[PDB]
Design a protein around this motif. Structure first.
Motif, PDB file in Angstrom:
ATOM      1  N   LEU A   1      -6.730   4.535  -0.697  1.00 32.03           N
ATOM      2  CA  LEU A   1      -5.331   4.893  -0.456  1.00 32.03           C
ATOM      3  C   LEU A   1      -5.282   6.290   0.157  1.00 32.03           C
ATOM      4  O   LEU A   1      -5.184   7.290  -0.559  1.00 32.03           O
ATOM      5  CB  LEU A   1      -4.516   4.805  -1.743  1.00 32.03           C
TER       6      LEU A   1
ATOM      7  N   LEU B   1      -4.635  -6.119  -7.438  1.00 29.32           N
ATOM      8  CA  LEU B   1      -5.562  -5.506  -8.385  1.00 29.32           C
ATOM      9  C   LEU B   1      -6.493  -4.524  -7.688  1.00 29.32           C
ATOM     10  O   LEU B   1      -6.768  -3.440  -8.214  1.00 29.32           O
ATOM     11  CB  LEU B   1      -6.366  -6.584  -9.108  1.00 29.32           C
ATOM     12  N   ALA B   2      -6.992  -4.890  -6.506  1.00 33.18           N
ATOM     13  CA  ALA B   2      -7.869  -3.998  -5.759  1.00 33.18           C
ATOM     14  C   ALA B   2      -7.152  -2.739  -5.287  1.00 33.18           C
ATOM     15  O   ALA B   2      -7.806  -1.718  -5.056  1.00 33.18           O
ATOM     16  CB  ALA B   2      -8.474  -4.737  -4.565  1.00 33.18           C
ATOM     17  N   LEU B   3      -5.828  -2.790  -5.135  1.00 31.64           N
ATOM     18  CA  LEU B   3      -5.086  -1.594  -4.749  1.00 31.64           C
ATOM     19  C   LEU B   3      -5.085  -0.558  -5.867  1.00 31.64           C
ATOM     20  O   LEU B   3      -5.112   0.650  -5.604  1.00 31.64           O
ATOM     21  CB  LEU B   3      -3.655  -1.966  -4.361  1.00 31.64           C
ATOM     22  N   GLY B   4      -5.056  -1.009  -7.117  1.00 34.26           N
ATOM     23  CA  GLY B   4      -4.975  -0.118  -8.255  1.00 34.26           C
ATOM     24  C   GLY B   4      -6.324   0.436  -8.668  1.00 34.26           C
ATOM     25  O   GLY B   4      -7.240   0.600  -7.859  1.00 34.26           O
TER      26      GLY B   4
ATOM     27  N   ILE C   1      -9.070   1.192   4.904  1.00 33.66           N
ATOM     28  CA  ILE C   1      -8.651   0.851   3.547  1.00 33.66           C
ATOM     29  C   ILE C   1      -9.691  -0.043   2.874  1.00 33.66           C
ATOM     30  O   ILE C   1      -9.982   0.110   1.682  1.00 33.66           O
ATOM     31  CB  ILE C   1      -7.242   0.218   3.548  1.00 33.66           C
TER      32      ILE C   1
ATOM     33  N   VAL D   1       1.304   3.810  -3.178  1.00 33.72           N
ATOM     34  CA  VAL D   1       1.014   5.228  -2.981  1.00 33.72           C
ATOM     35  C   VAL D   1       2.203   6.069  -3.428  1.00 33.72           C
ATOM     36  O   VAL D   1       2.041   7.143  -4.019  1.00 33.72           O
ATOM     37  CB  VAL D   1       0.635   5.503  -1.513  1.00 33.72           C
TER      38      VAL D   1
ATOM     39  N   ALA E   1       0.827  -1.202   0.000  1.00 33.14           N
ATOM     40  CA  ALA E   1       0.000   0.000   0.000  1.00 33.14           C
ATOM     41  C   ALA E   1       0.864   1.256   0.000  1.00 33.14           C
ATOM     42  O   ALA E   1       0.681   2.148  -0.839  1.00 33.14           O
ATOM     43  CB  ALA E   1      -0.949  -0.017   1.198  1.00 33.14           C
TER      44      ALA E   1
ATOM     45  N   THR F   1     -16.806  -0.365  -4.331  1.00 32.43           N
ATOM     46  CA  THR F   1     -16.169  -0.333  -5.638  1.00 32.43           C
ATOM     47  C   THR F   1     -15.388  -1.592  -5.982  1.00 32.43           C
ATOM     48  O   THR F   1     -15.026  -1.769  -7.151  1.00 32.43           O
ATOM     49  CB  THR F   1     -15.220   0.872  -5.740  1.00 32.43           C
ATOM     50  N   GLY F   2     -15.121  -2.467  -5.017  1.00 28.40           N
ATOM     51  CA  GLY F   2     -14.287  -3.625  -5.255  1.00 28.40           C
ATOM     52  C   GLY F   2     -12.803  -3.362  -5.166  1.00 28.40           C
ATOM     53  O   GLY F   2     -12.013  -4.306  -5.310  1.00 28.40           O
ATOM     54  N   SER F   3     -12.397  -2.121  -4.928  1.00 21.77           N
ATOM     55  CA  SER F   3     -11.001  -1.724  -4.842  1.00 21.77           C
ATOM     56  C   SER F   3     -10.676  -1.284  -3.419  1.00 21.77           C
ATOM     57  O   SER F   3     -11.499  -1.384  -2.505  1.00 21.77           O
ATOM     58  CB  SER F   3     -10.699  -0.611  -5.848  1.00 21.77           C
ATOM     59  N   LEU F   4      -9.455  -0.794  -3.234  1.00 17.81           N
ATOM     60  CA  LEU F   4      -8.958  -0.387  -1.928  1.00 17.81           C
ATOM     61  C   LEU F   4      -8.690   1.111  -1.906  1.00 17.81           C
ATOM     62  O   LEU F   4      -8.205   1.681  -2.888  1.00 17.81           O
ATOM     63  CB  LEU F   4      -7.682  -1.151  -1.564  1.00 17.81           C
TER      64      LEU F   4
ATOM     65  N   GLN G   1       2.187   6.429  -7.159  1.00 14.94           N
ATOM     66  CA  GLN G   1       1.129   7.245  -7.749  1.00 14.94           C
ATOM     67  C   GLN G   1       1.704   8.403  -8.551  1.00 14.94           C
ATOM     68  O   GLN G   1       1.182   8.750  -9.616  1.00 14.94           O
ATOM     69  CB  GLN G   1       0.194   7.763  -6.656  1.00 14.94           C
TER      70      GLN G   1
ATOM     71  N   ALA H   1      -8.578  -0.941 -10.657  1.00 15.11           N
ATOM     72  CA  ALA H   1      -9.398  -2.001 -11.230  1.00 15.11           C
ATOM     73  C   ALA H   1     -10.884  -1.831 -10.943  1.00 15.11           C
ATOM     74  O   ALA H   1     -11.693  -2.566 -11.520  1.00 15.11           O
ATOM     75  CB  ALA H   1      -8.928  -3.361 -10.712  1.00 15.11           C
ATOM     76  N   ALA H   2     -11.262  -0.893 -10.070  1.00 11.62           N
ATOM     77  CA  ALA H   2     -12.668  -0.738  -9.705  1.00 11.62           C
ATOM     78  C   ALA H   2     -13.518  -0.333 -10.903  1.00 11.62           C
ATOM     79  O   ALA H   2     -14.628  -0.847 -11.087  1.00 11.62           O
ATOM     80  CB  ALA H   2     -12.808   0.290  -8.583  1.00 11.62           C
TER      81      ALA H   2
END
Lengths: 48, 96, 429, 85, 187, 192, 149
Positions: free
Chosen positions: E108, C128-131, E96, C94, C90, E103-106, C97, C133-134
């Protein structure tokens, strides 16, 4: 030579190779017509 | 030089495992080996067998009468067996 | 020794107070380092974070040449616990970014991700969920499924083809995960692996769009998309894949199409594809018997790969190291010597194009390792000093002087001549 | 993974089949051998002259065959190096 | 599947996730997370150890989105109630993951009263600013082309040029020789 | 009883359509035959310039014939394999061969791809005339089509010389059939 | 109930080796919850399927919800309620093999059950805790229905 001398030949052999393929499907009418020719049949129709 | 009745000799490396030498290894496998063998065109089987550095164990003679006269009656029986088996199972047909 | 014995005793019986007492006294005496800390850092927040900070700072101090050394232990401590792994990802993402300087940040994050994957520990879906992808749930599903299975299924490939071919493609960076592109490369290039002929063109199109297509971005918003290298790139990938998976054709037919081969090899992704295809073909123990040239065309393709791009030079050096270190016992020593000489020529070429320091270090290690013949290093150094010209940098001179220090070179390459390579190099110092 | 009942049945079956496999007194095995040799003779055919002529040569023991020969196996290390063979 | 009571729920959670050696969330979390356990966590979350909360939070993400869709309220409730504990770790993870059911995402968000986070971010940002050019390209760059690499991190930076070469390498000789061989054999 | 009555529903046949290639395998077969002809011409040329190293244990003529026969057999086998690869799943030759009811893959190859090379006494067609096999050829010709290599297929028809060579090859089977019956019965009679 | 197994699958692949037969297609499927993998033959002529389709697979040991057993003989004129009413596609086969990761010392963790539906084979592979009702030489049903969701 300790092996059979009589085997399935000719049209019977060709059609039994074609018959036992994975995609040979028979409706109930043809199944009854075929079972009419089994002399050793026990008279029970198998579940399809 | 040489002996009579031997018109010509072929030096040959066997390809099939039948004529290849078979020895059980130390750990127990079979491990077929390939060694030079010769094929004459006549029959002596006595001067040939007595030659120096020629194996006197496995040197067969392919001739029934010579085998009989050199090695007795049971040897010619076994040779007849092997010859008939070869002439029959040559084409792949099998007889009990 | 007694410290280790006390640790074993403490771990053996939790019920004895003496063991915790001795552990505490060892900590008091200053030997708390002997107490286990590989799994302790996972339970510790601040100490783990600060050691991670120091490790990453040291990684950025020495560039790659120190990242290659500080990466194993750092990755071990980070990925030993999954929570620390997730927080590291994470924070690092960040950091990534920012569009300026984010390449190294993304590289380090991918290193952490791949080290976590190596232990059989999977977190691709969280990545994928960090990026971003939503905004594309279907693409997120397809990538997550493929990276969870580790295989490529035609259905999700078709779904991605429909998504990307449509008028609203997603961020291309998401489909540029090293594992995912590696899956494409493995499926499309490995001999003996079969793929559907009715989806071959879709696979090729998806790979080409993933690699060659360039998208303009500002403030995490898309601007424009470059499609210049889309048709020709797809055609080149198709031709090269046809060459790769149509193995029954001899290498002579491969040489016969050299114009098209060299035209299409200039694509870096295709260059890596042929690189690993050759790696896997020659990795066969029986391939050398089928390779009937003293200077085989495969090493010529490697030379072309090195000439085309410098990014593959680390990979070219790695493959050359693997090729040379492989000692063959089912070949005659004559062909072994011929292959080793040709590999020396390849190393000379690699050293010529600017990738020098790791090649020089590897050559010195081989010379000191006795795994290389004396005449081989003789030829290597002689031809190197033949082709290279002064002035030589302080780094190169420092790394090359101990190479000539070895007696195997001092007694062989030193010959009576007006232009002696070792003598002229020594006089240059 | 057989069970006791299965093993007993297996032993009984083996003994029964073996006792069934014994030859029957009165069988004219000579004619059977003659026919089992003759029937395959109707389908077959450096030089070795296999086939029906070889069968005639073996049956009629001829003091001279068409193509006599010897297969010689070398004993020592000479079997390996053709130079010393 | 019963609403096994609070203390018993905590005991079950610490039995399924209590392995201190196993610091990684097990793959079993795909089937271990059901409505009853998550609902019962609303009171036994205080009875869970910090490692149990961390592993539960990690395993919440390893769920199919059909299950997530049919467990929207329970997952948001457990996130909110885990966002009210003494552990800053669980607070941050709940914040987080609050975005996952939507949304299915995380999410930040950083730089919020976390000294290690702020210091690490600042030092790494300034360090990258020192050596933007000296950036190790990601593993995908060896597949990318010139324009893609330029857009991502900028133009290719040459390494240190040791010296000049007065004699052409054998690579060009081999290339020309094999080109001649291909031309001869093909024609 | 069961199969002969299901066959009335399924049916089975054979025809011209079951002996046709897709006009793309024909090009492959033609290229293979052309390459075989080129290779035998090259061997002949290298032979007449005394650039032919005799094979171990073989005379010059013997090794020449060995390379020629090897090339021709390679051509026949490759063309036959291509023909087998060309057949569809609905073809009747394939159905009757894979079941073992009648025929074999060599029959399919000879019907579709190429008849092959004719022989008498295990050798190519002998020089019945003076230093040639037929009046239509030229003296001392050892080429493929002058010594009994049937280039065509049974479907495509045989040219006159190939037809005559095929008749020669066929006569040997009849002669062998005539003599085998006369010998085997006597052998079995003496045994019994 | 006699429901040996029940889960949702999706068609991640079609016959990869090619179309061996005209009226039969080889389905490669992956599950969602248990993370199962499935290899199936279906009569593609009467029950067409496409890539990405989802279906509910319910392998039951009997078609009667009450749970009584059946002789296994075709008796179309039957009145008892049946599971087939709410399903599109039904087979009736007989499991013939059960593999696994067994060792000489400990038990198995990943199992694999093969059942043959009169010629159309099917392999169900997963974790040992689910394939418990599968015992060799026992007749089962398939009872799959497409999910349009």
């Amino acid at each position: 030579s300790n092996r059979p001398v009589m085997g399935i030949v000719q049209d019977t052999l060709t059609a039994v190779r074609k018959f036992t393929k994975r995609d040979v499907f028979l409706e109930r009418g043809e199944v009854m017509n075929l079972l009419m020719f089994l002399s050793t049949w026990d008279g029970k129709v198998p579940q399809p | 030089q040489g002996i009579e009745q031997i018109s010509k000799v072929y030096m040959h490396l066997p390809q099939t495992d039948n004529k290849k030498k078979i020895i059980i290894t130390e750990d127990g496998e079979f491990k077929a080996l390939q060694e030079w063998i010769l094929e004459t065109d006549g029959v002596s089987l006595m001067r040939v067998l007595s030659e120096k550095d020629v194996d006197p164990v496995r040197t067969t003679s392919n001739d029934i009468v010579e085998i009989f006269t050199v090695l007795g009656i049971e040897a010619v029986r076994k040779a007849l067996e092997r010859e008939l088996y070869h002439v029959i199972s040559f084409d792949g047909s099998y007889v009990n | 020794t007694w410290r280790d014995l006390f640790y074993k005793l403490a771990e053996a019986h939790p019920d004895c107070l003496m063991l915790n007492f001795t552990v505490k006294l060892i900590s008091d005496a200053g030997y708390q380092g002997e107490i286990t800390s590989v799994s302790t850092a996972c339970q510790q927040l601040e100490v783990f974070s600060r050691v991670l900070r120091t490790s990453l700072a040291t990684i950025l101090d020495g560039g790659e040449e120190n990242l290659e050394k500080n990466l194993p232990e750092f990755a071990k401590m980070v990925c030993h616990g999954e929570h620390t792994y997730l927080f590291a990802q994470a924070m690092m993402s960040v950091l990534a970014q920012e569009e300026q300087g984010g390449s190294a940040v993304r590289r380090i994050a991918q290193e952490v991700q791949r080290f976590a994957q190596e232990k059989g520990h999977d977190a691709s879906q969280i990545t994928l969920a960090l990026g971003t992808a939503a905004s594309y749930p279907r693409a997120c599903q397809a990538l997550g499924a493929m990276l969870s299975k580790g295989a490529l299924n035609p259905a999700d490939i078709t779904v991605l083809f429909k998504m990307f071919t449509s008028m609203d493609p997603p961020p291309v960076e998401l489909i540029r995960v090293p594992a995912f592109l590696d899956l494409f490369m493995q499926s499309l290039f490995k001999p003996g692996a079969r793929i559907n002929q009715d989806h071959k063109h879709k696979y090729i199109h998806i790979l080409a769009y993933a690699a060659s297509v360039v998208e303009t971005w500002k403030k995490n918003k898309r601007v424009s998309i470059n499609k210049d290298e889309l048709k020709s790139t797809s055609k080149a990938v198709e031709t090269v894949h046809n060459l790769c998976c149509n193995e029954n054709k001899g290498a002579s037919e491969l040489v016969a199409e050299l114009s098209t081969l060299y035209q299409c090899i200039r694509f870096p992704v295709v260059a890596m594809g042929v690189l690993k295809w050759v790696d896997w073909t020659v990795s066969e123990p029986r391939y050398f018997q089928l390779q009937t040239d003293h200077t085989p065309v495969h090493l010529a393709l490697l030379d072309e790969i090195s000439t085309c791009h410098q990014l593959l030079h680390p990979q070219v050096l790695q493959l050359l190291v693997k090729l040379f270190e492989t000692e063959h016992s089912q070949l005659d020593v004559m062909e072994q010597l011929e292959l080793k000489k040709t590999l020396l020529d390849r190393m000379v070429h690699l050293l010529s194009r600017g990738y020098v320091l790791p090649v020089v270090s590897y050559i010195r290690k081989c010379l000191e390792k006795l795994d290389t013949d004396i005449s081989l290093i003789r030829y290597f150094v002689t031809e190197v000093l033949d082709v290279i010209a002064p002035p030589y940098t302080s780094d190169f001179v420092q790394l090359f002087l101990p190479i000539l220090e070895n007696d195997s070179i001092a007694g062989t390459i030193k010959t009576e001549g007006e232009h002696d390579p070792v003598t002229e190099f020594i006089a240059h110092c | 993974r057989l069970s006791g009942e299965a093993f007993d049945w297996l032993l009984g079956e083996i003994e029964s089949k073996f006792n069934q496999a014994i030859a029957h007194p009165g069988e004219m095995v000579g004619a059977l051998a003659a026919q089992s040799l003759g029937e395959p003779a109707t389908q077959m055919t450096k030089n070795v002259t296999l086939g029906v002529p070889r069968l005639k040569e073996l049956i009629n023991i001829s003091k001279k065959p068409k193509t006599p020969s010897l297969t010689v196996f070398l004993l020592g290390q000479s079997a390996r190096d053709a130079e010393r063979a | 599947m019963a609403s096994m009571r609070e203390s018993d729920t905590g005991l079950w959670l610490h039995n399924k996730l209590g392995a201190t050696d196993e610091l990684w969330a097990p793959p079993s979390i795909a089937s271990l997370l059901t409505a009853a356990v998550i609902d019962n966590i609303r009171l036994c979350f205080h009875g869970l150890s910090s490692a149990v909360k961390l592993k539960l939070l990690l395993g919440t993400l390893h769920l199919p989105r059909r299950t997530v869709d049919e467990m929207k309220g329970a997952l948001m409730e457990i996130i909110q109630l885990a966002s009210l504990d003494s552990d800053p770790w669980v607070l941050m993870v709940a914040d987080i993951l609050k975005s996952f059911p939507d949304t299915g995402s995380l999410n930040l968000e950083l730089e919020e009263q976390n000294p290690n986070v702020q210091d690490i971010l600042g030092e790494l940002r300034e360090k990258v600013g020192e050596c933007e050019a000296s950036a190790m390209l990601p593993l995908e760059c060896q597949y990318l082309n010139k324009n893609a690499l330029t857009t991502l991190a900028g133009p290719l930076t040459p390494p240190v040029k040791h010296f000049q070469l007065k004699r052409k390498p054998k690579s060009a000789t081999l290339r020309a020789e094999l080109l001649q061989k291909s031309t001869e054999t093909a024609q | 009883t069961v199969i002969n009555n299901w066959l009335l529903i399924e049916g089975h046949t054979i025809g011209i359509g079951d002996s046709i290639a897709d006009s793309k395998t024909y090009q492959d077969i033609q290229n293979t035959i052309k390459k075989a002809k080129q290779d035998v011409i090259e061997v002949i040329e290298k032979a007449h310039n005394n650039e032919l190293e005799p094979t171990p244990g073989n005379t010059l003529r013997q090794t020449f014939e060995n390379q020629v026969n090897r090339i021709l057999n390679d051509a026949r086998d490759k063309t036959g394999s291509s023909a087998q690869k060309s057949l569809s799943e609905y073809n009747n030759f394939k159905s009757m061969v894979v079941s073992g009811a009648k025929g074999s893959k060599i029959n399919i190859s000879q019907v579709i791809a190429v008849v092959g090379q004719q022989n008498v006494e295990g050798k190519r067609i002998p020089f019945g005339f003076k230093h040639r096999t037929l009046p239509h050829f030229i003296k001392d010709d050892y080429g493929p089509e002058s010594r009994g290599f049937v280039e065509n297929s049974y479907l495509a028809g045989l040219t006159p010389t190939e037809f005559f060579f095929h008749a020669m090859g066929g006569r040997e089977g009849l002669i062998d059939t005539a003599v085998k019956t006369a010998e085997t019965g006597y052998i079995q009679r003496r045994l019994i | 109930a006699g429901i040996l197994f029940e889960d949702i699958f999706d068609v991640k692949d079609i016959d990869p080796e090619g179309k061996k037969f005209d009226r039969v297609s080889r389905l490669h499927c992956e599950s969602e919850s248990f993370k199962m993998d499935l290899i199936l033959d279906v009569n593609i002529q009467i029950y067409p399927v496409d890539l990405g389709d989802k279906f509910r697979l319910v392998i039951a040991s009997t078609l009667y919800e009450d749970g009584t057993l059946d002789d296994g003989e075709y008796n179309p004129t039957d009145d008892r309620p049946s599971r087939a009413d709410q399903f599109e596609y039904v087979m009736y086969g007989k499991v013939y093999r059960i593999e696994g990761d067994e060792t000489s010392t400990e038990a198995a963790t990943r199992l694999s059950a093969y059942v043959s539906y009169g010629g159309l084979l099917m392999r169900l592979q997963g974790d040992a805790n689910n394939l418990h009702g599968f015992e060799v030489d026992s007749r089962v049903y398939l009872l799959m229905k497409k999910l349009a969701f």
